[PDB]
Amino acid sequence: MDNRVREACQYISDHLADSNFDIASVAQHVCLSPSRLSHLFRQQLGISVLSWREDQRISQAKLLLSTTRMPIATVGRNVGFDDQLYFSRVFKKCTGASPSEFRAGCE
């Protein structure tokens, strides 16, 4: 992870709840172009920016969910998810099991 690339996370982090995401602002934040930044991003992150964002979204949801007792509806808001079912639907395939099952600890 390059310092320049790491800085991008700072901007995206603040807009983690935002719906309209513009990769343009990401490159501008690092005083670099989107193509040049994107190239190094996938090289340093080994994945696409769009994928990295989603990956962290799920990891954060499950991480906080462990230290929190809020409902799936509220938790979703933390990940910018407005639809409670949307989070469970995506998260379900993410690990292969729904959030209600994992949290319950049921085999």
37 burial (CB, 10 Å; 0-12 / 13-18 / 19+) is: buried
Residue whose pair of structure tokens reads 């930044």 in the numeric block = 37
The answer to whether 23 and 34 have CB atoms below 8 angstroms apart is yes
Task: Supply the Cα-derived Rg of the chain in whole angstroms.
Answer: 15
The answer to whether 44 and 2 have CB atoms below 8 angstroms apart is yes
Domain containing 44 equals: 1-107
Which own/partner pairs from 7-13 qualify as long-range (CB within 8 Å, at least 24 positions apart)? 8/37, 8/41, 12/53
- Show Cβ contacts of residue 35 under 8 Å, excluding neighbours closer than 6 positions: none
**What phi, psi does 21 have (nearest 5°)?**
-105, 125
The answer to whether 45 and 6 have CB atoms below 8 angstroms apart is no
User: Is residue 50 within a helix (H) or strand (E), and if so which, with residue range?
Assistant: helix 49-67
Residue whose pair of structure tokens reads 């395939």 in the numeric block = 93
The tokens describing 74, both together, are: 């509220």
Q: Cβ–Cβ contacts within 10 Å for residue 104, how many?
A: 9
The tokens describing 57, both together, are: 């979204």
User: Is residue 67 within a helix (H) or strand (E), and if so which, with residue range?
Assistant: helix 49-67
State how far the alpha carbon of 90 is from the alpha carbons of 61, 68, 102, in Å: 12, 20, 14
| CATH (domain of 85) | 1.10.10.60
| Total domain count, the chain | 1
The tokens describing 27, both together, are: 């490159």
- Show Cβ contacts of residue 5 under 8 Å, excluding neighbours closer than 6 positions: 30, 37, 40, 41, 44, 45
- Show Cβ contacts of residue 64 under 8 Å, excluding neighbours closer than 6 positions: 75, 78
